[PDB]
Amino acid sequence: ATGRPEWIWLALGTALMGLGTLYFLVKGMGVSDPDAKKFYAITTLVPAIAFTMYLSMLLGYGLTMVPFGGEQNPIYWARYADWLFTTPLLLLDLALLVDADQGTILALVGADGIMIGTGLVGALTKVYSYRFVWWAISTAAMLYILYVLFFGFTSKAESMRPEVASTFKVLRNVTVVLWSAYPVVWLIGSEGAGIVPLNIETLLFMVLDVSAKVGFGLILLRSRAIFGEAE
Ligand SMILES: CCCCCCCC/C=C/CCCCCCCC(=O)OC[C@H](O)CO
Ligand SMILES: CCCCCCCC/C=C\CCCCCCCC(=O)OC[C@H](O)CO
Ligand SMILES: CCCCCCCC/C=C\CCCCCCCC(=O)OC[C@H](O)CO
């Protein structure tokens, strides 16, 4: 018996990420269109990275104890190593779908790195009140990203192939609804106010992670928008 009550959700998350990796890897076999190859490679790497980090949490490697509030608090730091590499890849899927300009992609990836990097600092900070200063900076970086996705990409997708505009609009709406939930769980969870216990928080993140990575990929890779217009 594992002593951590949240282990059942880490085990399920590891299995779904693994099955998602294998499904995408087999579906991509034989795809020869170079454009589709780009989206298969980016989208298959997302669950493959998350699989190794969920496994590290399940085995206890990606966990550490952070003193704050007079209590040793168990912080899963492996979540941020996961998100550092998977969240910019998800943004690249959207940016390449709309043929975004290079300067915009750099702005998105750079703000994404600030978002995850300050969230890591906030999770490891020992002065309790300062943890919410880093939460606020990270959340401001996210709001810059959400703005670009609505008032920068949407304007350009509408001037492209109808299948690209329709698929982008769906993946854009999914992204904004799912990404906006992460700061709320972090704030009321063990990393912040501590109102939700760690076992329920782990359940919430696992549902969000699978929907935002596997659910996101199932919508993208079944669409014709990833293929170049050909006869
Ligand atoms: C798509 C099909 C799948 C649908 C799945 C979506 C569900 C997402 C998970 C939700 C939160 C549930 C958390 C369980 C509630 C536990 C809270 C509780 O009862 O705590 C009691 C405490 O002892 C006294 O307050
Ligand atoms: C039980 C199963 C557990 C889950 C599996 C273990 C994951 C770790 C292993 C391998 C990395 C394999 C390669 C990952 C890179 C995939 C990129 C890709 O396939 O892109 C296709 C593109 O079209 C090509 O040009
Ligand atoms: C397109 C870009 C593709 C990017 C592909 C990158 C995927 C790498 C994945 C995983 C291993 C992560 C391991 C992180 C190493 C942490 C080890 C550490 O520093 O631990 C310190 C201390 O010993 C204990 O707390």
Ligand SMILES: CCCCCCCC/C=C\CCCCCCCC(=O)OC[C@H](O)CO
């Ligand atoms: C956590 C930090 C590490 C991970 C961060 C991920 C950043 C990935 C790199 C670059 C974006 C630079 C612009 C790349 C966009 C090029 C798309 C394009 O416009 O087409 C040109 C392309 O060469 C086809 O011809």
Ligand SMILES: CCCCCCCC/C=C\CCCCCCCC(=O)OC[C@H](O)CO
């Ligand atoms: C645009 C989409 C993304 C937006 C993301 C930003 C949303 C920030 C929301 C709320 C602050 C609410 C804070 C409430 C925390 C109070 C906890 C507390 O101290 O109360 C203890 C508890 O009530 C005793 O049981």
Ligand SMILES: *C\C=C(C)/C=C/C=C(C)/C=C/C1=C(C)CCCC1(C)C
């Ligand atoms: C792999 C799945 C997704 C959708 C991951 C998204 C992560 C975030 C939106 C993280 C947000 C954070 C902020 C803005 C503030 C608290 C710390 C976080 C890093 C969790």
